[PDB]
Amino acid sequence: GPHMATGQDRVVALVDMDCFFVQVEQRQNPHLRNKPCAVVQYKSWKGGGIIAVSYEARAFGVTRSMWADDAKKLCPDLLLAQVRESRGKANLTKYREASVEVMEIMSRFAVIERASIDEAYVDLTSAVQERLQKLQGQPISADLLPSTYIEGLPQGPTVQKEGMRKQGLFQWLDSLQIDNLTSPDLQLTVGAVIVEEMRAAIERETGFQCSAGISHNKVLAKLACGLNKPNRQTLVSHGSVPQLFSQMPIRKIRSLGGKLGASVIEILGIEYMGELTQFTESQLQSHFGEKNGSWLYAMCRGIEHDPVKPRQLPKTIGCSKNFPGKTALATREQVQWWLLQLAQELEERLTKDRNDNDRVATQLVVSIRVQGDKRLSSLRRCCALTRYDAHKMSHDAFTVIKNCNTSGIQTEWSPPLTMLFLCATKFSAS
DNA sequence: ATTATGACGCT
DNA sequence: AGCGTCAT
Ligand SMILES: Nc1nc2c(ncn2[C@H]2C[C@H](O)[C@@H](COP(=O)(O)OP(=O)(O)OP(=O)(O)O)O2)c(=O)[nH]1
Ligand SMILES: [Mn+2]
Ligand SMILES: [Mn+2]
Ligand SMILES: [Mn+2]
């Protein structure tokens, strides 16, 4: 009752750029705009691997992790842009630099947590309080929410998309308690006004469109963001959670799309998020551990406490390349040459990071995969990173891995390596 | 031959 | 520290 918490203390948004790498290439090359198009890495094997897909191309069934040749079977007029290749490997610098453009704009409105190259959480609680105090009580016009959906509305007692969106928004606004500066629904609504402004600024100043979710925590904001893509934002209120979760497959919630989610389904004999409410907190902890159990108990009621961390820069700067099938590395000269290539890209990126961001990495993590190993990484070892020098970094990586060569011959490398990965970590201010 | 990342939890 | 999971 009056003491049972409802997880409505914050306003959190998740902003995700639509088909980002595609939008970056479409900005650069206007011939690709408003077309079925995709971004690919490499080209020789099956046309290259697709990693991003415009919504026009998605309508034909084109997806990520599809070979370009197969995509062309679904969509013969598909247009393709290729990721840059430098030092023999894919180089993602163009997309990282575009990401910094967007993140710097977002940071003008609130402190952000960079969750990926293309998405960031926003803690809007304080900005909402500000705008409400500037809002001397007058209601929020629908004109301030021109791209907002209210999940679950319209309901109760026109056959167009935009008409439905507007009906739901009008039902929502009509029911608003605009006189109460502590009303969570009002706070979410003002958060959505701010996110409209942030998304408008991103598009005006970069050309890029995005989607967003507004709710009371990170998981609901992420889920909300996915409900109406592209170029739209969705408000998920606390009150919308019972209906939303009653038909929500457990795997759709962030962190439950893998083995843990499958075990929730198999152990409890349930399918949907809402079914979790019938278990006690102790029951869930008994199956899934104390941390997971408390998290699930709260999450299935719409409640989650993970903070938006004030972190707009990545914590690690890494370089990796797979050597699949017959391209696996089988000589010492080969291994050394590719370690050097990776280390030279790493040096370039680290030196730019030090100039931009006033910090230096201090640990080098070296990871490899050996042929026939099912795991992504067969081995991970760390060593000291004391100098931003590619030859030193590659020599050190070779020293940390050289005992994995089981070949008696010092010239050959066996079993051959199917992955190399260098990662700079443990930053200190400088 | 589903690639190049990046974050975080466990012990 | 080194490994596993999750995201995509
Ligand atoms: N190199 C590489 N990049 C990836 C991979 N998966 C995704 N990316 C990149 C390309 C995408 O444009 C970008 C953002 O990922 P998202 O899941 O947010 O999808 P995207 O923005 O493409 O589409 P959407 O958000 O659904 O509109 O990340 C991958 O496996 N390898
Ligand atoms: Mn995206
Ligand atoms: Mn994303
Ligand atoms: Mn995607």
Side-chain angles (χ1 to χ4, degrees):
Chain A
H3 318 283
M4 77 139 75
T6 62
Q8 291 174 283
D9 46 288
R10 302 178 286 156
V11 181
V12 173
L14 187 276
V15 175
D16 182 69
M17 314 304 299
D18 303 323
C19 51
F20 191 49
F21 290 21
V22 162
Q23 284 200 86
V24 174
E25 297 294 333
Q26 289 174 318
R27 180 172 73 172
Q28 181 181 318
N29 181 354
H31 277 332
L32 306 176
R33 300 176 180 183
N34 310 126
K35 301 294 190 313
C37 62
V39 171
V40 77
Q41 323 176 287
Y42 308 118
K43 211 86 190 54
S44 276
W45 189 270
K46 297 206 236 254
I50 291 173
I51 55 167
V53 184
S54 79
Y55 282 76
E56 293 84 347
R58 295 181 191 197
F60 288 87
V62 183
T63 68
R64 74 173 275 278
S65 298
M66 190 175 272
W67 297 113
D69 289 347
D70 295 333
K72 275 289 199 179
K73 305 170 182 164
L74 297 174
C75 177
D77 293 315
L78 179 69
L79 300 180
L80 301 175
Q82 290 185 68
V83 168
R84 177 191 197 149
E85 274 171 62
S86 303
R87 290 181 246 262
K89 64 179 294 299
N91 187 305
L92 307 178
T93 298
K94 188 196 305 181
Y95 314 105
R96 289 191 186 96
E97 296 187 350
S99 175
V100 171
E101 291 180 69
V102 170
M103 300 300 174
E104 290 186 344
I105 295 157
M106 294 177 67
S107 298
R108 297 206 307 256
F109 298 77
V111 151
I112 74 169
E113 176 181 345
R114 189 204 194 259
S116 78
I117 201 164
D118 94 307
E119 98 210 49
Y121 294 92
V122 198
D123 195 312
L124 295 165
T125 309
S126 297
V128 161
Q129 225 51 69
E130 303 249 38
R131 187 70 46 81
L132 269 171
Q133 276 140 217
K134 179 201 304 178
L135 281 158
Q136 198 194 333
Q138 54 290 84
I140 290 148
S141 162
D143 292 335
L144 300 183
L145 295 164
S147 64
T148 297
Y149 281 80
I150 310 296
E151 171 62 26
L153 298 179
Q155 61 129 219
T158 174
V159 297
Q160 29 166 317
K161 212 178 328 309
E162 174 67 9
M164 292 292 277
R165 181 199 77 84
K166 274 167 136 183
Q167 299 182 274
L169 181 58
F170 289 121
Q171 291 191 351
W172 173 256
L173 297 181
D174 276 359
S175 309
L176 257 196
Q177 188 190 10
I178 78 196
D179 42 277
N180 179 15
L181 325 159
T182 66
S183 169
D185 288 347
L186 178 58
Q187 292 173 321
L188 289 186
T189 304
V190 172
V193 171
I194 292 171
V195 174
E196 292 274 12
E197 290 161 1
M198 321 202 351
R199 291 179 49 247
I202 292 169
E203 185 174 8
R204 179 193 91 80
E205 299 178 28
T206 73
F208 300 145
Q209 292 182 349
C210 57
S211 299
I214 305 94
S215 190
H216 287 299
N217 53 61
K218 292 163 65 172
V219 166
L220 291 180
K222 178 67 172 165
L223 187 67
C225 183
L227 293 177
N228 297 282
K229 270 196 155 279
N231 198 33
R232 297 290 183 266
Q233 54 183 66
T234 304
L235 187 162
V236 161
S237 65
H238 183 75
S240 74
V241 170
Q243 284 208 252
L244 180 61
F245 278 9
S246 73
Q247 301 193 83
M248 197 49 66
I250 281 158
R251 71 181 172 270
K252 299 298 181 204
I253 292 294
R254 179 143 161 90
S255 82
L256 298 182
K259 289 181 212 192
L260 174 63
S263 70
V264 174
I265 287 165
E266 171 149 85
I267 287 177
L268 302 181
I270 62 174
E271 308 171 68
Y272 305 119
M273 255 330 275
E275 295 182 81
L276 281 162
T277 64
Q278 293 317 116
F279 301 90
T280 69
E281 191 172 3
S282 302
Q283 280 180 310
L284 297 176
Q285 293 173 321
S286 84
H287 293 298
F288 312 112
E290 151 193 359
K291 176 154 261 258
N292 284 335
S294 291
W295 185 86
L296 289 162
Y297 182 86
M299 196 77 249
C300 71
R301 296 164 168 76
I303 299 172
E304 193 221 15
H305 297 304
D306 189 41
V308 177
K309 299 174 168 211
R311 189 186 66 245
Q312 130 171 233
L313 308 172
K315 281 181 154 113
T316 59
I317 294 185
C319 292
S320 70
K321 185 170 174 44
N322 292 353
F323 303 92
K326 298 209 92 216
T327 201
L329 314 186
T331 73
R332 199 193 37 52
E333 215 81 79
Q334 239 189 332
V335 173
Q336 290 176 353
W337 190 81
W338 281 109
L339 283 168
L340 179 59
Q341 299 326 286
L342 283 185
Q344 286 176 350
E345 177 184 334
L346 187 56
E347 157 160 20
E348 188 172 272
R349 284 163 65 189
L350 283 176
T351 295
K352 170 63 162 23
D353 182 78
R354 186 178 64 213
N355 287 334
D356 280 351
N357 300 317
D358 302 309
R359 56 181 196 170
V360 79
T362 71
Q363 215 175 48
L364 184 71
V365 175
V366 183
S367 183
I368 71 197
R369 172 164 198 212
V370 315
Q371 198 180 57
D373 197 319
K374 164 157 183 174
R375 303 169 291 170
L376 167 139
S377 164
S378 295
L379 175 168
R380 238 172 301 178
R381 283 297 193 265
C382 76
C383 66
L385 205 177
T386 81
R387 263 225 299 141
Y388 282 7
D389 173 294
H391 286 99
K392 179 171 174 51
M393 281 198 267
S394 63
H395 177 306
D396 288 347
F398 180 78
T399 301
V400 294
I401 69 159
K402 84 216 188 150
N403 51 310
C404 321
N405 190 4
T406 44
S407 165
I409 320 179
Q410 192 255 7
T411 312
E412 313 315 285
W413 197 289
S414 61
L417 308 185
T418 52
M419 187 267 285
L420 300 177
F421 187 9
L422 296 178
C423 187
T425 69
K426 313 268 197 81
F427 284 94
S428 300
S430 66

